[PDB]
Design a protein around this ligand. Structure first.
Ligand SMILES: CC1=C(/C=C/C(C)=C/C=C/C(C)=C/C=O)C(C)(C)CCC1
Ligand SMILES: CC1=C(/C=C/C(C)=C/C=C/C(C)=C/C=O)C(C)(C)CCC1
Ligand SMILES: CC1=C(/C=C/C(C)=C/C=C/C(C)=C/C=O)C(C)(C)CCC1
Ligand SMILES: [K+]
Ligand SMILES: [K+]
Ligand SMILES: [K+]
Ligand SMILES: [K+]
Ligand SMILES: [K+]
Ligand SMILES: [K+]
Ligand SMILES: [K+]
Ligand SMILES: [K+]
Ligand SMILES: [K+]
Ligand SMILES: [K+]
Ligand SMILES: [K+]
Ligand SMILES: [K+]
Ligand SMILES: [K+]
Ligand SMILES: [K+]
Ligand SMILES: [K+]
Ligand SMILES: [K+]
Ligand SMILES: [K+]
Ligand SMILES: [K+]
Ligand SMILES: [K+]
Ligand SMILES: [K+]
Ligand SMILES: [K+]
Ligand SMILES: [K+]
Ligand SMILES: [K+]
Ligand SMILES: [K+]
Lengths: 259, 258, 259
């Protein structure tokens, strides 16, 4: 999808690409290591067994959708390794996972929402998946559009995220009462991350260089690195611990849900 | 995937991009509104089984039953993006109008999947990939500036001709199964399918990439009408067919003619 | 994704694109015909019935995942028809399935591994699918990267293929003892292809023009055409025959597996 490249003399001074590339690459490398390790731990813990007691699976293998958290974290860590390669190369490399904003997100966060929908048995999994997909593609279109019509694309995205976020939240409530207080605690701390950090991205768009111009692209990269540390890694760890508590309640102890 | 852009002085006069962009954008906006509303109604009606609105035993509809509305909403979102591109004068970096049939590789394969799920047609993956490859051959034909585009088109015609001849046969095998009311809705949906899907190959021949009889602006308008029919009207007919089938088999508990 | 094009005067003499394009196109056309015919035979044989006796399916149709071998072969044959179109056009065609190396592979070989995982009932099908996906995307990134960081991307790919290949192989062993000696023979000859030809691609990268410079891009295209003839077509035929033998053992004769 690439047409631009770093000029032979380097990025023009004062442009949005005139960033601290060693620092951005180091941040991306640290994020890659942390998120990939979190995904590896997620998959290893999933293969250990059900619940905190590590009860062996009857079929000998975990459910395939249960690997989504670790798979998404490992994919995000691989993309962050690629991002570190791009930043350490000075940016603007042909395979830049940093250039097109939210393009990487169209790969992780839809699946992430799918993982969420699978962990909480939320209805309309395909609907949520496609809502997230279209919101992220509207964001990509907004960030590649140089005219004012980018604010149209952003608005289009806000027309897909506002219902979805209001729908998911409602459904999450319907599931929250079902789970026991320990699984409820883990679910609460994960939903805090979800419904307090997913809205940040739309707000970050407004104050970015494509909006009011308060946040530079370098600061945007750092902020989104921290958000991916929270939205992928910490959220996936909270999902894994919630699943372990649920399996301990319902599979190891055989107790029923509050449904 | 984009390399071209609208020249600073505008599109060259007499080129295929020298179109009526306010008109194309208005048509795309109207199509966006209609298709998105049709998908919203499809999902709302799905969440309401059958005309009696019998509650689901699990409390939620089957996930594949949302495909019609999901596809219509995705097509409406793409038409909103198309209206943004046309109102910007075309050649916008995120142009869903530039690469022809590129948007279709997202909607119509899933659409065929939806069809295969509604009629319990065999070889759903086969049909999905046949549609996928036909549409990608069309994209390759439209981006190819040499005569080898007619090769790509031919390649697409090598994937659509069997598929359309296979699906039709399978549709016959399913048509006798359903009751006369579901048969009526299925007949009117299959009329749209087997009379409008062949139009695209014929439209290629007479387009600016063929004999040069249909301009790109007329192509955009014709395909907007086709997407109004192939996505929205077809999805409404599928939703009504599913409602009639659910009324026959779930609300009344009657068996199919199988 | 394309920015480059064949110069009006033709490819510069001595460049990596200064290849024998009629020969490459003829090879691609022959590969297209063979792989597409192999996929057509795979689907026809699958529709014939279960096993060598062609026992009719109880539901009247084959399992949908059983069509993966033929579907992948037909998709690869279609991409080879497109490759022949590109080569006969002189290369550098806007829709070039030859330009970006391993970009076509991100479509076939992940699904292929999925097919394998479905035929052998291997655990962690999503994990294997995403491992292959990320390995191939790392290869694409390495081949589009003009700096030394391509060897980073390659290394990243080697960080995803080395565990996966070591994991799959282990799981394959766990399945190998399950199947009868005839299915074991077909599985052995397919695993020979897998574990002796998949490692070739990483080795071919090192000696390619992007590495030590021993293998030209034309030779690379010919070698990968032969590999796709083996890794898609011959491997799919071996999978089809293994499935027929398994169906004859377990469905036609009703005999149990050695599990
Ligand atoms: C509404 C909206 C947006 C939404 C972004 C979201 C919801 C991003 C989530 C990212 C995550 C969860 C990343 C984790 O790895 C954009 C693209 C800013 C702009 C267009 C409209
Ligand atoms: C055979 C063939 C074609 C087929 C097109 C079809 C079958 C399109 C269907 C579109 C739909 C149903 C859109 C709805 O939103 C092309 C691409 C014209 C050209 C190459 C060969
Ligand atoms: C490890 C590695 C690679 C692996 C390639 C493989 C494993 C390719 C398989 C291809 C097949 C099976 C094709 C069949 O149609 C690359 C991309 C060379 C380079 C980066 C790292
Ligand atoms: K799960
Ligand atoms: K996991
Ligand atoms: K990332
Ligand atoms: K990018
Ligand atoms: K980015
Ligand atoms: K950028
Ligand atoms: K995760
Ligand atoms: K997660
Ligand atoms: K359905
Ligand atoms: K629907
Ligand atoms: K559209
Ligand atoms: K397009
Ligand atoms: K178009
Ligand atoms: K165009
Ligand atoms: K539809
Ligand atoms: K439909
Ligand atoms: K199979
Ligand atoms: K097959
Ligand atoms: K190929
Ligand atoms: K390519
Ligand atoms: K290639
Ligand atoms: K090339
Ligand atoms: K195959
Ligand atoms: K195969």
């Amino acid at each position: 999808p690439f047409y631009d490249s770093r000029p032979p003399e380097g990025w023009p001074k004062g442009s949005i690409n005139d960033m601290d590339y060693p620092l951005l690459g180091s941040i991306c490398a640290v994020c890659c290591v942390f998120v990939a390790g979190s995904g590896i731990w997620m998959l290893y813990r999933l293969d250990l067994g059900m619940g905190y007691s590590c009860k062996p699976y009857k079929s000998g293998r975990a459910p395939e959708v249960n690997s989504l958290s670790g798979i998404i974290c490992l994919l995000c860590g691989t993309m962050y390794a690629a991002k570190s390669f791009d930043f350490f190369d000075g940016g603007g490399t042909p395979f830049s996972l940093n250039w097109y904003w939210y393009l990487d997100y169209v790969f992780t966060t839809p699946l992430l929402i799918l993982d969420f929908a699978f962990t909480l048995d939320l209805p309309h999994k395909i609907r949520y998946f496609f809502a997230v997909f279209l919101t992220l593609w509207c964001g990509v279109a907004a960030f590649v559009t140089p005219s004012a019509y980018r604010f149209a694309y952003y608005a289009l995205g806000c027309c897909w995220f506002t219902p979805f976020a209001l729908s998911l939240m409602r459904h999450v409530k319907e599931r929250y009462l079902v789970y026991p207080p320990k699984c409820q605690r883990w679910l609460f701390w994960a939903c805090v991350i979800f419904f307090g950090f997913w809205p940040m991205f739309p707000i970050l768009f407004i104050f970015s260089w494509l909006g009011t111009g308060h946040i530079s692209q370098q600061a945007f990269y750092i902020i989104h690195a921290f958000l991916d540390l929270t939205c992928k890694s910490i959220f996936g760890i909270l999902m894994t611990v919630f699943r372990l508590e649920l399996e301990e309640h319902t599979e190891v102890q055989g107790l029923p849900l509050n449904e």
